[PDB]
Amino acid sequence: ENCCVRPLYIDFRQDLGWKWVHEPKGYYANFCSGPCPYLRSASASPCCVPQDLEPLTILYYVGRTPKVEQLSNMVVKSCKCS
Amino acid sequence: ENCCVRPLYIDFRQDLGWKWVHEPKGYYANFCSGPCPYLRSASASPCCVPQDLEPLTILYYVGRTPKVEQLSNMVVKSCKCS
Amino acid sequence: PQLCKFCDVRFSTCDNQKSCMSNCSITSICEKPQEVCVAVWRKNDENITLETVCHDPKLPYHDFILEDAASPKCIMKEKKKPGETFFMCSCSSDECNDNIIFSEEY
Amino acid sequence: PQLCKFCDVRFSTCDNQKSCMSNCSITSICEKPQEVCVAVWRKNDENITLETVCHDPKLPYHDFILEDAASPKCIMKEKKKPGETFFMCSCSSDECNDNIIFSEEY
């Protein structure tokens, strides 16, 4: 094995405690996991952490008015050793 | 294997570019390396990083005057997963 | 920030029940900080409706006072209204108007 | 911050050599920013000494000017001094007075 994105579904109400998101009820946030090399190629050995983070589009209400917006860096899209 | 302190000797002149340290010529700085658990017990999987950092005592000169002092967090003494 | 069910007026089958779920899928962040949750249940000779909204307790609603606003639960109290049976409650804990209780809790 | 060999005056065996190492184990951070490195070589009828220090080029040293201070290398130049052979150089790159050069480089 190696370092990479692992799927992880997050439920807003159950896992984040957010009761105000109308849709979606949850989403694939994912996370980084996996072995990296002993040494570095440009303290401690390298770690498997997120590289590209993407945003998530949600729908919620303020008063009786629906609002569609997006939260940045909600989805781990790629991982890197470092 | 697991996560722990790995010995690593650092030479001031050769590795840090410091030509002004009179003694010692170098020292064991060490580093953290090793597998950690997939999950967490109180993003990405846990990593092996330093826990306790100790200081280093050095001797150097300012003009013809010797000075003994200490640099903090120079020596990795223990590692932790997180 | 106060969260409340906010489906405005909807038909409901809540009747001859000690308590009822609002079945409102809209949980809203009230747009003004002092607003609390409200639920209004009414039955006329044709149907039953349940209204859920956020509302400032310093203001009347259907011309009545929201006297129970500090309460964490929505305990329905009857209001005199000709030609129908009218009950209302207000409360101030998140989504508290999602569960409406008739008469007192056991 | 300028670093210089700073062993003050020591005996030396540097003689009949195009260049010489100072053999000074003390590399010092000069205490004042404008100081440069200096080396003084002298031979009397009894011995040879080599002096290494940091020194402000705006100030005389052994009553002479450090005219070559901007130079990165310590190029020894003779000074007239009765009863001995006296050479001196100054320079301003780290530890530059660790290598003293007699006559010009090839």
CA distances from D92 to D1, D28, D51, D66, D69 (A): 10, 13, 16, 11, 6
CA distance B3 to B37: 10
Q: Report chain breaks in chain B, C–N > 2.5 Å, as residues after which they occur.
A: 42
CA distance D62 to D51: 11
A81 touches chain B (CB under 8 A): no
Cβ atoms of D52 and D28 closer than 8 Å: no
> Across-strand partners of A58?
A69
**How close does chain B come to A17, measured CA to CA in Å?**
17
Q: Which of A3, A4, A7, A25 is nearest to A16 (CA)?
A: A25
Q: Which fold has domain C1-106?
A: CD59 (2.10.60)
B63's tokens: 């003009």
Tell me the CB-side half-sphere exposure of residue D90, using CA atoms within 13 A.
Answer: 21
Cβ atoms of B48 and B67 closer than 8 Å: no
Q: Which of D71, D100, D80, D83 is nearest to D7 (CA)?
A: D100
Q: What is the 3-state secondary structure (H, E, C) of C57-106?
A: CCCCECCECCCCCCCCCEEEEEECCCCCEEEEEEECCCCHHHEEEECCCC
D13's tokens: 């065996």
Cβ atoms of A36 and A46 closer than 8 Å: yes
B41 touches chain A (CB under 8 A): no
CA distance C52 to C71: 16
Instruction: Give the chain B residue nearest A4 (alpha carbons).
Output: B44
Q: Which of D10, D30, D33 is nearest to D22 (CA)?
A: D10
Strand order in the sheet with D36-43: D8-11, D48-55, D36-43, D85-91, D74-79, D99-102, D19-21
Structural domains of chain B, ranges and CATH numbers in brackets: 1-82 (2.10.90.10)
- Picking from B19, B61, B64, the nearest residue to D95 by CB comes out as B19
**How close does chain B come to A62, measured CA to CA in Å?**
29
SS3 D77: strand
β pairing state of C99-102 and C74-79? parallel
Exposed / middle / buried, residue C106 (Cβ in 10 Å: 0-12, 13-18, 19+):
exposed
> Which residues in chain D have Cβ-Cβ distances shorter than 8 Å to B62?
28-29, 31
Q: Which residues of D sit within 8 Å Cβ distance of B?
A: 3, 6, 8, 25-31, 53-54, 94-95
A2's tokens: 């190696």
Q: What is the 3-state secondary structure (H, E, C) of chain B?
A: CCCEEECCEEEHHHHHCCCCEEECCEEECCEEECCCCCCCCCCECCCEEECCEEEEEEEEEECCEEEEEEEEEEEECCEEEC
Q: Residues with Cβ < 8 Å from C97, sequence gap 6 or more?
A: C4, C5, C22, C37, C38, C39, C52, C74, C89, C90, C91
Q: Which of C1, C6, C93, C87 is nearest to C54 (CA)?
A: C6
Cβ atoms of A32 and A6 closer than 8 Å: yes
Q: Residues with Cβ < 8 Å from B14, sequence gap 6 or more?
A: B26
Q: Residue B28 corresponds to which amino acid? A: Y
A44·B45 Cβ contact <8 A: no
Q: Residues with Cβ < 8 Å from B39, sequence gap 6 or more?
A: B45
Phi-psi sector, D22: left (phi>0), alpha (psi -120 to 50), beta: alpha
Q: Residue C104 corresponds to which amino acid? A: E
> Which residues in chain A have Cβ-Cβ distances shorter than 8 Å to B36?
none
Q: Which of D5, D89, D15 is nearest to D53 (CA)?
A: D5
CA distances from B55 to B25, B71, B72, B74, C11 (A): 16, 5, 4, 5, 72
Q: Residues with Cβ < 8 Å from A28, sequence gap 6 or more?
A: A7, A8, A9, A10, A75
Residue with tokens 């920030």: C1
C27·A62 Cβ contact <8 A: no
Q: What is the DSSP string of A39-82?
A: S----B---EEE--EEEEEEEEEETTEEEEEEEEEEEE--EEE-
Q: Residues with Cβ < 8 Å from B58, sequence gap 6 or more?
A: B21, B22, B23, B24, B68, B69, B70, B71
CA distance D14 to D19: 8
Technique employed here was: X-ray
Partners of chain D (3+ Cβ pairs below 8 A): B
D33's tokens: 């920013």
Sign of CA dihedral A40, B78, B71, D94: negative
